[PDB]
């Protein structure tokens, strides 16, 4: 009895060890507030650039290893353990929107943080 | 999937980080070949391409630095 | 995976003598090693083997496994023929 | 049932090392009193640039090995190394993301406060 | 069968389809050999080919002399 | 008569420019009687610079087999 | 293994794992410098084992050959 | 600097328990566990592992621990009958 | 947990302290504008630091090698 | 500290060596893009031109040359 | 340690009295050697195992000596055995 | 222990600062140095004990 | 000490002040990299002192290998 | 005996190492000494084997 | 040339019986052993003379004539032995 | 001296005057460096003298190759 279980139970174990159980959700998100893309300024006598939600976010994340969690303004921890480097961000202009590759916790925290960035603008007239 | 390496990485790093130049570069070529004597068709193709040009070379060159390092490395396996 | 062949209950109800034991195993090693040593042989002779970086990748481990096959088997025989002359002589 | 304590014990010990413990976290810090972007000056005869408080403070963390503290005018989770911590300005909205332990943006926080002060205007005549 | 080729397959099943790249960009460009897009791709793959073949084989060899070591020292 | 794997190779490079082992010489027959026409001079510039180009990457290639090969070879020591 | 019978990690190991990192993408540097050390050290540890099992042997053999 | 102690008063060994081992030869049982094994196996699991560097290390201590056994045993017997031929001529 | 000649490499992976990332970092500012001249002025500074550190790294670990296998071999 | 080597110090010693060059030449030409009929900014633009020019030459050979003096020492530890 | 030298005020030895029989005397001989080199071949392997010793070269010059010290030891009682009873052998033959 | 220690600390400055040129010709030296000094001891030390084993053996 | 020290450093007394005119000719030229004197000047010095290095470096190799090829007779 | 004039041709040298003359001429001696120094050590082994190998013999 | 001594008178002794030339034959041998032996050792360590093919060389010679020395002493001394063992057995 | 200074000597004499006729025409040419009969001159002498020299190394370096594997086999 001990010999049958010792051996069944480590080969389902190597049986096992291939299946992949990470799985990529896409989030779509339209912005309400401000165009998506990058915008540039051509002024009279100066050129400026203004980066978008996207870029800047890529360029955040950049390389990081550790996971994201509490942003503020057996297996399952095994899945959680999702590197930030994998977030993909990708500006969809013509419904201006964001495409999110990600875990579902990271598309979550995303959408918490553009939510966090896409505020309407006041207006100034000066005379 | 397509299986990519090191070096592959190092060479789409260029090809994303110039968006369009791959493109702009016909674009501007063909809009020359319609009108050969105008000098702002000229000055534009001028511009594009001596950029391509500068490019292909930073590219090519990288790539080889690289290969000859790790080239450099395993020999000391034996 | 191509023609596989295995015998089954080899010692169940049937048991050989020594004498022909001996005779079994030398004569199926000395013919595996001699079907070996002309394969290797015609994987060098031919143009087309010689030339490719895959054909050669495959050469350098059938020539690896020949060596270590022959050195394993001389190396046992010559121990245990040890043995034999530490029984008998006097 | 020493022997099973010991291995029982081990095991369940080396089952957890793949785990990872440590996290990251975001802070958006809007400033008050100042430009984000780094200010440039056109003149008749003159060029100045002006670096930001981004481009500064990266400047001055870049590399850093040791854990930061007491800025002045299981625990291993705690000791996250400096030079992790990462700052991008966002002049859109005129704030600063920052990327790092919860310690960390407390640091930069308290930092940006120190330094984002108004200015006093002098006319001359 | 044998472990040193288990070693040796364990780089081919690393490298999943490289064997076929290479002959593919080398098909396309020998269409038009003057293509520098063409050539770009090439020069990289080529590369990525010769340090997989060297390192496969200088690994072997490695494994081979422990393997040859141990034998004799059954002696 | 064998054929290597090596010439192989090269037989890819011409199976692939096919005929234009061919044009650079009927493009220079032509020209060599009346080196003043410009259309002929604007053919010949681009089917010498293709032959150039083909023959040089042809020969490197073979090279770095050759190359590779040899170092595989070395260890069947 | 995941088996005890009652009654750290070794080169062994460490050797198999670089390995198989490394034969994901054989052209990185920082992964074939990672490997060369350790196929070295497991080179230099599985030669150091067998002939000092060879020396204790041939104590052995040298004993009885004495007392015969 | 680190975790550092020493016994200063007394020789007690510590790298070894002392142990019953002391007092055998040859861990007979031990040889009849692996001699076990290496025979009962007849077309189960695999032939022919001359080559993994991990098995062929634990191969080694065998295929010398019992040539070392059976070389004793022929002295043990030859010293046997030759203190009964020695006695009953004396 | 690891040997001595792990403890040699080490050495130089933490004596050039952060080079391996800056490397990263220059070449993804240049890939952005090729063109740059102060772009490419740094760029070949860093590559040319790395290719002598793997070098150095490497040719030590061999020697350090050499120098054990022959100790061993006295063994016998 | 950035770490720095050894062939970024001897790049730098350059950099600070010409300490306002790399400036005066982007302002010399917004004055020349300005107007550039005028002689007094074309010749003025001239000279600094040239002077960028050669300090990027110098330099980079420079680098080259201590980069190739190491790689033959280290060549010898084996 | 290595700062420090450490005597012994007059060495009396207790154990160069006699006082114990033939046999005493043996049994101390074997214990002491068995428990010696059971103890030295257990450092030995130890010594290989541990990965920080095996791969330095400061540690495996001293391992070289200790194996060949262990050696010429084992090597000696047995020679020194093999003449003491070959001794008894030759004189009762006679 | 004097060989052993230079080599140590001649392998930290460098380690500092891996393309001085003065750098690398001075370990280069050390290094070889060490290099010869293992291999000669080595290789006495074993001729010293064979010459014992040769001896129990002669008369064994 | 030892005697590759000794040979190596024979060529460091041998050139006295090398190492450091490289360094101040480079500090001179840094200052006007236009300067044709300083050009010619610092051309000289810095061929000058990579020859240097090169015959240090390949003859404490050539001495290596002679005592090495001593050494491995003691056996 | 070779020994010092190895040793003073390096001493020269070491004076002007640019100078092609010394060049050639220590090439030419560093090459002699080297090749002079193995086959001295070689056929001292050779020897002391062969007279180890008698004692071997008869013991 | 700096510090350096030599002993010019040796101390002397009567011979008189097989018995004294025996123990002065033991004790010069003994001597000149130790001496070569710690003189070796020495050579080996000062990194001087570790490192100059000129002392290597010398080295050399003096590691064979020890080897040699000891190697005739055994063997003189075994076969002296083991004539008087086979004329006293026979 | 041995035979490869026979070797090097053989050059040394092979060529009369070179070295000497070198070391004049660069010091006709440095007093009046604009004359192209003395640059005509000089260019050819320089050449030989680099062919010479280049010549001479590799043939001392061939021999030593040769007396080295012979050495080797007196084991
Ligand atoms: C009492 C005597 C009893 C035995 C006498 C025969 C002595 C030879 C024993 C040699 C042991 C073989 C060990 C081989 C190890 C191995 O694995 O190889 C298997 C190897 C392959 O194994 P596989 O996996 O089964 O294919 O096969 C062989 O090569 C076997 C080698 C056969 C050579 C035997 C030659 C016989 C010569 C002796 C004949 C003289 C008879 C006189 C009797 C004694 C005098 C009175
Ligand atoms: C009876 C005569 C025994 C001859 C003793 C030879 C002494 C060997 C020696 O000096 O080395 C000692 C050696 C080293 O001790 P040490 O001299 O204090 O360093 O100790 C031993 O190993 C002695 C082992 C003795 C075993 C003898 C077998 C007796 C079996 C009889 C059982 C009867 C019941």
Redo the contacts between chains.
């Keep these: 009895y001990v010999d049958m279980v010792?051996n069944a139970?480590?080969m389902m174990?190597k049986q096992n060890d291939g299946i992949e159980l990470g799985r990529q959700k896409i989030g779509v998100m339209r912005l309400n507030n401000?165009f998506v893309g990058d915008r540039t300024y051509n002024l009279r006598?100066?050129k400026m650039v203004?980066?978008g939600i996207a870029t800047?976010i890529e360029?955040?994340?950049?390389?990081?290893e550790?996971?994201?969690?509490?942003?503020?303004?057996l297996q399952e921890?095994?899945k959680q353990?999702a590197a930030?480097g994998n977030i993909k961000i990708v500006a969809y202009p013509d419904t201006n929107s964001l495409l999110v590759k990600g875990t579902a916790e990271q598309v979550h925290f995303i959408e918490m943080?553009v939510k966090?960035?896409d505020?309407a603008k006041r207006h100034v007239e000066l005379s | 999937t397509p299986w990519s390496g090191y070096l592959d990485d190092v060479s789409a790093k260029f090809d994303t980080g110039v968006d369009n130049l791959q493109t702009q570069v016909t674009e501007a070529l063909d809009k020359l070949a319609a009108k050969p004597s105008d000098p702002a068709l000229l000055a534009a193709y001028q511009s594009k391409l001596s950029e391509y040009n500068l490019y292909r070379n930073a590219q090519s060159n990288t790539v080889k630095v690289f290969k000859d390092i790790d080239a450099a490395i395993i020999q000391n396996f034996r | 995976v191509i023609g596989q062949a295995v015998n089954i209950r080899s010692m169940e109800t049937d048991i050989v003598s020594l004498d022909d034991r001996l005779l079994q195993a030398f004569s199926g090693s000395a013919i595996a090693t001699a079907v070996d040593k002309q394969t290797i042989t015609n994987r060098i002779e031919d143009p087309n083997l010689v030339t490719d970086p895959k054909e050669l990748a495959i050469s350098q481990e059938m020539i690896s496994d020949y060596n270590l096959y022959v050195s394993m088997v001389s190396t046992l025989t010559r121990k245990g023929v040890g043995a034999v002359e530490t029984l008998l002589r006097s």
Excluded at chain 1, 59 to 64: I, N, V, Y
Aim: proline share 6%.
């Design positions: 010792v139970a480590t174990d401000t006598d100066q203004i980066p800047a360029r955040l994340l950049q390389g990081e550790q996971p994201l969690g509490n942003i503020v303004s921890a095994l353990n930030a943080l966090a960035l505020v």
